[PDB]
Amino acid sequence: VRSLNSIVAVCQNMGIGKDGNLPWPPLRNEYKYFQRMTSTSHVEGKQNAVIMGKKTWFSIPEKNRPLKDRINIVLSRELKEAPKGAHYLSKSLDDALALLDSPELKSKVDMVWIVGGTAVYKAAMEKPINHRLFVTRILHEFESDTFFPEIDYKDFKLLTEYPGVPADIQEEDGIQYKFEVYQKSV
Ligand SMILES: NC(=O)c1ccc[n+]([C@@H]2O[C@H](COP(=O)([O-])OP(=O)(O)OC[C@H]3O[C@@H](n4cnc5c(N)ncnc54)[C@H](OP(=O)(O)O)[C@@H]3O)[C@@H](O)[C@H]2O)c1
Ligand SMILES: C[C@H](O)[C@H](O)C1=Nc2c(nc(N)[nH]c2=O)NC1
Ligand SMILES: [Ca+2]
C-alpha cells in the first residue's frame, strides 16, 4: 500500500499486554484516542482498515466486534475462515496488503492501521514502506507479558509535532502518558 500506520499504547518496559488483556485498567480518553484515530478517514465514502492478529481479535469483547466503522482484518495461519464478525482473514501481512490493493477493497479503503499484537507490528515495521507510528507512552509500570518490538531509532524519526495530537503529557485516573509520532520515510 502507499503507507502504513501503526498505533500502540506502551508502558515503561514497552509492555502492551498481560493475560490476554491490556496491562492497565481502562483509560477512557486514551481509548477514545485509539478510536478517533483508527476510525477517521479523510474521504467521504471510505472507511479505514484495521489489521490485527488472532489474539488481539479475541481480546475484544464479543458483542463489541468487529470494531465499528472500520474493515476488520484478522491474520492467522491456523484459521480456515474469518472469525465471526471479522470482514476478512489473511495468512500474512503481505497477503493482507495485497487484499487491500484488490479492486473491491481499493476504492473502499482510506487508511490502513496495524493494531498489533507484537508479531504484526514487527512485520509492518520491517516493510520498506512509508510508515507512521503512533505511540502512547504511559509513564508507569504495569506487569506485562507481551511487548512492543524494538523501534529502529535510525529509521523511525520522532516528530516534535503532529496535527491533532496533544503535545503535553496527559493524565487520567492518576496516570500520566504522552502521545508520540514516529515517522519512517522511504
Ligand atoms: N497496548 C496495545 O496497544 C495493544 C495492541 C494489541 C494488543 N494488545 C495486547 O496484546 C495481546 C495480544 O497480542 P499477541 O502479540 O500475543 O498476539 P496477536 O499478534 O494479537 O495474535 C497472534 C496470532 O495471530 C496470528 N499472527 C500474528 N502475527 C501474524 C503474521 N505476521 N502473519 C500471520 N499470522 C499472524 C497467529 O495466529 P495463529 O496461531 O492462528 O497463526 C499468531 O498466533 C493481548 O494482551 C492484547 O490485549 C495491546
Ligand atoms: C484493538 C484492541 O483494543 C487493542 O488491544 C489495541 N488497543 C489500543 C491500541 N492503541 C492504543 N493507543 N490504545 C489501545 O488501548 N491499539 C490496539
Ligand atoms: Ca498458533
Q: Which grid cell is 181? A: 509520532
Rounded distance from Cα 25 to ligand 1 centre (Å) = 20
| 117 belongs to an annotated ligand binding site | yes
| 76 belongs to an annotated ligand binding site | yes
Residue in the block written with cell 503481505: 94
User: Pairing mode, if any, of strands 146-147 and 131-138?
Assistant: unpaired
Residue in the block written with cell 491456523: 78
Site residues for ligand 1, CB cut-off 6 Å: 8-9, 16-17, 20-22, 52-56, 59, 75-79, 92-93, 115-120, 123, 146
Residue 150 among the catalytic residues: no
Nearest-angstrom CA–CA distance, 140 and 38: 25
Amino acid at 173: D
Q: Which grid cell is 70? A: 472500520
Half-sphere exposure of residue 84, counting CA atoms within 13 Å on the CB side? 4
| 54 belongs to an annotated ligand binding site | yes
Around Cβ 40, how many Cβ atoms within 10 Å?
Answer: 14
The single residue of 4, 22, 67, 133 carrying the catalytic annotation is 22
Nearest-angstrom CA–CA distance, 98 and 75: 13
Q: Which domains does the chain have, with CATH numbers?
A: 1-186 (3.40.430.10)
Give the experimental resolution in Å: 2.4
Around Cβ 26, how many Cβ atoms within 10 Å?
Answer: 10
